[PDB]
Amino acid sequence: GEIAQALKEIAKALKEIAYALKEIAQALKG
Amino acid sequence: GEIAQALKEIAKALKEIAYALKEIAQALKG
Amino acid sequence: GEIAQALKEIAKALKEIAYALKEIAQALKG
Amino acid sequence: GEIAQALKEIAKALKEIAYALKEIAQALK
Amino acid sequence: GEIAQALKEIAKALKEIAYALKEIAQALKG
Amino acid sequence: GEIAQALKEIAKALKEIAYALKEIAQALKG
Ligand SMILES: [N+]
């Protein structure tokens, strides 16, 4: 249903954010 | 089903965010 | 059940996020 | 309905966010 | 009504995260 | 009700992340 779909799309967004922040972690460590 | 999967993907995403943010804490503190 | 477990993992994840962000706040302000 | 509207706004938001994060990936890599 | 509000707040939060990470990307490039 | 609460707590967490990351942006612009 609609809630299932909403949350699947949110899951995807947060997984890309995980990735972005892991790249930032590395960049700042030097 | 679909709800179980949605929430399991949110669990995974949020656990990677916990990790990423702790690596940021470390980077910024030295 | 799968939903019960999913929600327990969300609870846990958000407690680690709360903490991580406290550490970030502190790094930057002090 | 309220959920119908929420999801219409969410689709748009997430398409912009997808792109933003693609630009971030590229900047760093 | 509670779920409608939850989802609206997620949408907004993720747009602010997108922005913050664009600013971080730029800082580290420059 | 448990899902509604989970997502309300996610909204809160992600709003605090927005804050943290905007403070990082500023710190690194230095
Ligand atoms: N729900």
In A1-30, at which residue ranges do the beta strands (DSSP E only) sit?
Answer: none
Query: How do the domains of chain A map onto residue ranges?
Result: 1-30
Experimentally, the structure was elucidated by X-ray
Mapping DSSP to helix (H, G, I), strand (E, B) and coil, where does residue C30 land? coil
Burial (Cβ within 10 Å: 0-12, 13-18, ≥19) of residue B4: middle
Burial (Cβ within 10 Å: 0-12, 13-18, ≥19) of residue F23: middle
Model resolution, angstroms? 1.5
Q: What's the token pair of residue E5?
A: 């509000």
Q: Name the DSSP class of E16.
A: H
What is the C-alpha to C-alpha distance for residues F8 and F12, in angstroms, rounded to an integer? Answer: 6
Which residues make Cβ contacts (< 8 Å) with residue B26, sequence separation at least 6?
A: none
What is the C-alpha to C-alpha distance for residues E28 and D29, in angstroms, rounded to an integer? Answer: 11
Q: What's the token pair of residue F7?
A: 């997502």
Q: Which of D17, D21, D28 sits opposite E28 (nearest CB)?
A: D28
- Is F22 touching C (CB cutoff 8 A)? no
Q: Which amino acid is at D2?
A: E
DSSP H stretches of helix in C1-30: 2-29
Residue whose CA is closest, atom 1 of ligand 1?
Answer: F3
What is the C-alpha to C-alpha distance for residues C19 and A11, in angstroms, rounded to an integer? Answer: 22
* Contact yes or no for E18/D17 (Cβ under 8 A): yes
Q: How far is CA B27 from the centre of its chain?
A: 17
DSSP H stretches of helix in chain D: 2-28
